[PDB]
Motif scaffolding. Structure first.
Motif, PDB file in Angstrom:
ATOM      1  N   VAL A   7       0.815  -1.231   0.000  1.00 61.54           N
ATOM      2  CA  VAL A   7       0.000   0.000   0.000  1.00 61.54           C
ATOM      3  C   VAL A   7       0.844   1.275   0.000  1.00 61.54           C
ATOM      4  O   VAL A   7       0.544   2.210  -0.733  1.00 61.54           O
ATOM      5  CB  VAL A   7      -1.020  -0.041   1.165  1.00 61.54           C
ATOM      6  N   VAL A   8       1.882   1.323   0.817  1.00 59.94           N
ATOM      7  CA  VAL A   8       2.765   2.474   0.854  1.00 59.94           C
ATOM      8  C   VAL A   8       3.537   2.627  -0.476  1.00 59.94           C
ATOM      9  O   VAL A   8       3.661   3.726  -1.032  1.00 59.94           O
ATOM     10  CB  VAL A   8       3.743   2.398   2.091  1.00 59.94           C
TER      11      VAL A   8
ATOM     12  N   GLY B   1       3.071   1.011  -3.506  1.00 64.52           N
ATOM     13  CA  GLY B   1       2.297   0.952  -4.714  1.00 64.52           C
ATOM     14  C   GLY B   1       2.324  -0.368  -5.425  1.00 64.52           C
ATOM     15  O   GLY B   1       3.129  -1.234  -5.105  1.00 64.52           O
ATOM     16  N   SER B   2       1.470  -0.486  -6.435  1.00 63.31           N
ATOM     17  CA  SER B   2       1.415  -1.668  -7.308  1.00 63.31           C
ATOM     18  C   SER B   2       2.727  -1.959  -8.066  1.00 63.31           C
ATOM     19  O   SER B   2       2.994  -3.103  -8.475  1.00 63.31           O
ATOM     20  CB  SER B   2       0.208  -1.607  -8.245  1.00 63.31           C
TER      21      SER B   2
ATOM     22  N   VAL C 188       3.581   9.998  -9.824  1.00 68.83           N
ATOM     23  CA  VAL C 188       4.181   8.826  -9.229  1.00 68.83           C
ATOM     24  C   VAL C 188       5.611   9.125  -8.739  1.00 68.83           C
ATOM     25  O   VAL C 188       6.131   8.462  -7.806  1.00 68.83           O
ATOM     26  CB  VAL C 188       4.220   7.558 -10.148  1.00 68.83           C
ATOM     27  N   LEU C 189       6.274  10.110  -9.390  1.00 61.51           N
ATOM     28  CA  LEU C 189       7.600  10.557  -8.955  1.00 61.51           C
ATOM     29  C   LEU C 189       7.558  11.696  -7.900  1.00 61.51           C
ATOM     30  O   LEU C 189       8.617  12.154  -7.440  1.00 61.51           O
ATOM     31  CB  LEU C 189       8.454  10.988 -10.150  1.00 61.51           C
TER      32      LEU C 189
ATOM     33  N   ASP D 173      -5.748   8.453 -10.524  1.00 63.42           N
ATOM     34  CA  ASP D 173      -6.028   7.150  -9.879  1.00 63.42           C
ATOM     35  C   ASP D 173      -4.988   6.098 -10.266  1.00 63.42           C
ATOM     36  O   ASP D 173      -4.558   5.300  -9.427  1.00 63.42           O
ATOM     37  CB  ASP D 173      -7.395   6.627 -10.267  1.00 63.42           C
ATOM     38  N   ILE D 174      -4.543   6.121 -11.525  1.00 64.60           N
ATOM     39  CA  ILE D 174      -3.474   5.232 -11.981  1.00 64.60           C
ATOM     40  C   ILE D 174      -2.204   5.554 -11.221  1.00 64.60           C
ATOM     41  O   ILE D 174      -1.527   4.671 -10.715  1.00 64.60           O
ATOM     42  CB  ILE D 174      -3.282   5.338 -13.524  1.00 64.60           C
TER      43      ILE D 174
ATOM     44  N   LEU E 234      -1.888   7.020  -8.300  1.00 69.00           N
ATOM     45  CA  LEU E 234      -2.063   6.662  -6.903  1.00 69.00           C
ATOM     46  C   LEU E 234      -1.854   5.159  -6.653  1.00 69.00           C
ATOM     47  O   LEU E 234      -1.160   4.747  -5.706  1.00 69.00           O
ATOM     48  CB  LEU E 234      -3.453   7.065  -6.430  1.00 69.00           C
ATOM     49  N   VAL E 235      -2.500   4.333  -7.474  1.00 69.78           N
ATOM     50  CA  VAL E 235      -2.397   2.894  -7.286  1.00 69.78           C
ATOM     51  C   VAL E 235      -0.969   2.420  -7.528  1.00 69.78           C
ATOM     52  O   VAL E 235      -0.421   1.627  -6.724  1.00 69.78           O
ATOM     53  CB  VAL E 235      -3.448   2.144  -8.139  1.00 69.78           C
ATOM     54  N   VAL E 236      -0.346   2.919  -8.596  1.00 66.99           N
ATOM     55  CA  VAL E 236       0.984   2.483  -9.004  1.00 66.99           C
ATOM     56  C   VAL E 236       2.059   2.966  -8.026  1.00 66.99           C
ATOM     57  O   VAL E 236       2.981   2.227  -7.651  1.00 66.99           O
ATOM     58  CB  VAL E 236       1.317   2.966 -10.433  1.00 66.99           C
ATOM     59  N   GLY E 237       1.916   4.221  -7.609  1.00 70.75           N
ATOM     60  CA  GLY E 237       2.908   4.886  -6.788  1.00 70.75           C
ATOM     61  C   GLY E 237       2.734   4.761  -5.307  1.00 70.75           C
ATOM     62  O   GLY E 237       3.674   5.045  -4.560  1.00 70.75           O
ATOM     63  N   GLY E 238       1.550   4.326  -4.852  1.00 72.61           N
ATOM     64  CA  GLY E 238       1.296   4.028  -3.452  1.00 72.61           C
ATOM     65  C   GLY E 238       0.766   5.175  -2.616  1.00 72.61           C
ATOM     66  O   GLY E 238       0.676   6.317  -3.080  1.00 72.61           O
ATOM     67  N   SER E 239       0.488   4.909  -1.349  1.00 67.24           N
ATOM     68  CA  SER E 239      -0.041   5.949  -0.460  1.00 67.24           C
ATOM     69  C   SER E 239       0.911   7.093  -0.162  1.00 67.24           C
ATOM     70  O   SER E 239       0.458   8.164   0.237  1.00 67.24           O
ATOM     71  CB  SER E 239      -0.557   5.328   0.853  1.00 67.24           C
ATOM     72  N   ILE E 240       2.226   6.916  -0.386  1.00 74.92           N
ATOM     73  CA  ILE E 240       3.143   8.077  -0.288  1.00 74.92           C
ATOM     74  C   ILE E 240       2.799   9.139  -1.313  1.00 74.92           C
ATOM     75  O   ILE E 240       3.241  10.270  -1.202  1.00 74.92           O
ATOM     76  CB  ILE E 240       4.686   7.710  -0.379  1.00 74.92           C
TER      77      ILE E 240
ATOM     78  N   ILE F 217      -0.284  10.244  -1.717  1.00 76.12           N
ATOM     79  CA  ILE F 217      -1.464  10.942  -1.233  1.00 76.12           C
ATOM     80  C   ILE F 217      -1.280  12.449  -0.975  1.00 76.12           C
ATOM     81  O   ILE F 217      -2.115  13.236  -1.460  1.00 76.12           O
ATOM     82  CB  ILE F 217      -2.152  10.198  -0.050  1.00 76.12           C
TER      83      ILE F 217
END
Lengths: 101, 117, 100, 97, 101, 119
Positions: free
Chosen positions: A71-72, A74-75, F54-55, F83-84, F86-92, F94
């Motif tokens: 989760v932290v 990412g995918s 994502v970066l 959304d892509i 966010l999912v790919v890059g993770g909760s960091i 946010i």
């Protein structure tokens, strides 16, 4: 012949920060696992998985840690997570066959 | 103060975004609920990941949670040391900020001001 | 690729050509950046170049130590592989073989 | 393997590439860009396959990869080289059935 | 912090002391690493040290160009900040104001 | 803050004065890769947004949001892209997504108010 005195001291510090204090060794090796997974270093993941198993972590403890990394981080971490779970299964098989880890 | 306020406002908006965004935020909450690892431990794991990845708001959030769940400063510092050694000297500015924020949280605790989110 | 890809590759080559900083220096910088960003093929490339431009093992190690402290113990697997590849280069050298 | 959370996360990863106001080809190209700047080979391979399945041309893919190159730096070059090699593999498969 | 925190900071200082590479060179390497990793406080630190060790703006810019090309256009905001900070240091230098950490 | 963003971009490009030929070439390539080809400008700017998110580069996120808005992207299209990321890059990601949504709201308010969005 390889590196300097500074290199050696740094490697030593890397071992030292995982020794138990107020946090126990299993917890620290799980933290090493989490950090290694979000940073996507396969050799590091494999090292800390071995240590986690050696220090008596359950598969569920390892999975719950891996979920936090997923989760932290990412995918993008999924291929590493997949490799980690496969390697854990090899470790458990060795255990069942009485091989030293 | 602000930190808390901005978190609420974000979760308020996540009205805006999509179903997928909402689902993500729900999973982010879920993975820190108690399991075989207790919530203190999971929140310390969150702190470590947040620190090696150098996200200050994430660090702050997980520091709050670690303090709420009864982690000591010594436990926190042992976790932060792993993050420092693994992630490098680039982590130092974040560690500095983490320690300042922890001190603020301890002062609030000293004064009976509930640490909430 | 495209015209843009070619132009980018050309810039990547150009930034290591010497100026007020000499080529050994720039290739050692390439090595440092490649190591903290954990790119093995990049590390290999700049190691070859450092050796070609007369860098000593000690100069290389001093640079790798900066990358290790800045980038963290997460770089250790790459640092290990870097030193192993350097040793291979040195052995080629002692055997009269060409580092091309 | 994993928990219910792991499963939900994997499900969410699939879901975000389903079509909406952006079509699936566009979304898969975005996954390609993200995967390339982040330097994940297995992710790059996955999204290349999907891009090809969704009818993306080599030129479309190259223009996306150029964005990832400039954004992510010359450090992405080894990955870009592998992406192109793999794209050529898929096109040969396409030619042959 | 802990003894381990102290040891890490001691190593961070040590790796920039003069060796076969001089301090100016080591600090330029610190600058490049800091820039590709996009740490503003680290960039500022190493810029101060580069300036103190007699690096020229042209030397600094050649180094930053490596970091820009290797680390990508995501580096640009940090490069902007680095150049602004360098201009501040050069104004101090012009004005005979001691630059000290 | 939009105005502050515009002036700092302006001053930097003016400064890239002090750039080497290499720095100038890089900046020109950064602009070139978003010019339209078989992929259109809206698409390329949305890719820039995904990569920048994502970066975790706030100023880069801001820049591509402006361009996406200028090129007629909808909030829905922007959110599907984010959304892509966010999912790919993770909760960091946010904190950056929060800032992105805030900035987009500022741009939409400018648009509502008939205020020119320019860089």
């Amino acid at each position: 012949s390889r590196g300097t005195l500074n290199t050696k001291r740094f490697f030593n510090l890397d071992s030292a920060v995982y020794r138990p204090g107020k946090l126990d060794v299993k917890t620290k090796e799980l933290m090493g696992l989490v950090a290694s997974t979000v940073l996507r270093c396969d050799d590091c993941i494999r090292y800390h998985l071995v240590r986690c198993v050696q220090e008596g972590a359950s598969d569920e403890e390892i999975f719950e840690a891996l979920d936090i990394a997923l989760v932290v981080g990412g995918s993008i971490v999924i291929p590493h997570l997949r490799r980690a779970v496969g390697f854990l299964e090899e470790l458990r098989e060795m255990e069942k066959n009485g091989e030293t880890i």
